[PDB]
Structure formats: C-alpha cells, structure tokens
C-alpha cells in the first residue's frame, strides 16, 4: 500500500528534515553524515566508536518499517551525532554540523508533538 501511517509520516518527516535542511549559504548538513566511510578510510573510527551509523543505515531501518515509535528514531541519530562528536575535534565542520543538525532533530520532533 502506497499511503502511509501516521507514524510511518512522522517517522518519515524527521528523517527529512534533518536530511534536507541547508544553511542560508545552501548548503546541506547531512550530506557527509549518509553514509559511512570504510575501516581503511577513516583510521581507527570503528576500533573506537560502539555503535556505527548513518543516514543510510537509518533510511534503511525507516523503509522497511522497524521503527516502533519516533523516540527510536530520534535516538539512531542522536547516536550518530555522538559518534561523529566523538570521532572528530570540536573546531571540525562535521562536529559543528553535527550540533546544529541535532538541533534540527529536536525543533523538528518538538513541532510534531500533537502531530
Ligand atoms: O565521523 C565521521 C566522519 C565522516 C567523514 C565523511 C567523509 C569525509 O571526507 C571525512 O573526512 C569524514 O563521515 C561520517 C558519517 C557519519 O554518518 C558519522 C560519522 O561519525 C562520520
Ligand atoms: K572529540
């Protein structure tokens, strides 16, 4: 079936938002944040960080329908924001990126509280 529940819309929404959100120069925050870079491309990214992801790994969990609730969502990018604050130095662009993009997360699903 082509219509969505209202959850999968919701579900749907968040993950747009913070995918399609540019800055007043047009640039669009998530586009490093998609997908992961390898083992050999990022040096000791996955001895260090617990639980990988992305966008992609987040789409994917979305399209086939294994988000209960907006809240595990939510949590899948606020994991992925950590990693990459994790991972990289405060003065970085994605680290930057990564706070204002969290932000996004959190006005958005605060905007969809009555739906
Ligand atoms: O730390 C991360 C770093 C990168 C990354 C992606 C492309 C680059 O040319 C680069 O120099 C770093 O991509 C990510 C993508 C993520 O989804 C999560 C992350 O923590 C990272
Ligand atoms: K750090």
Redesign the pocket.
């Known amino acids: 079936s082509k219509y969505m529940t209202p959850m999968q819309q919701k579900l749907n929404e968040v993950y747009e938002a913070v995918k399609n959100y540019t800055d007043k120069r047009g640039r669009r925050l998530s586009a490093?944040?998609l997908r992961?870079?390898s083992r050999s491309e990022?040096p000791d990214y996955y001895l260090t960080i617990k639980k990988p992801?992305?966008?992609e790994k987040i789409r994917s969990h979305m399209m086939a329908n294994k988000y209960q609730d907006i809240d595990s969502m939510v949590e899948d990018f606020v994991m992925?924001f950590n990693?990459?604050c994790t991972?990289?130095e405060p003065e970085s662009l994605?680290y930057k990126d990564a706070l204002v993009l969290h932000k996004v997360l959190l006005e958005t699903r605060r905007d969809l509280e009555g739906d």
Do not use: G, K, S, T
């Open positions: 490093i944040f992961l870079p990022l992801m992305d966008m992925m990693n990459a991972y990289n994605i």
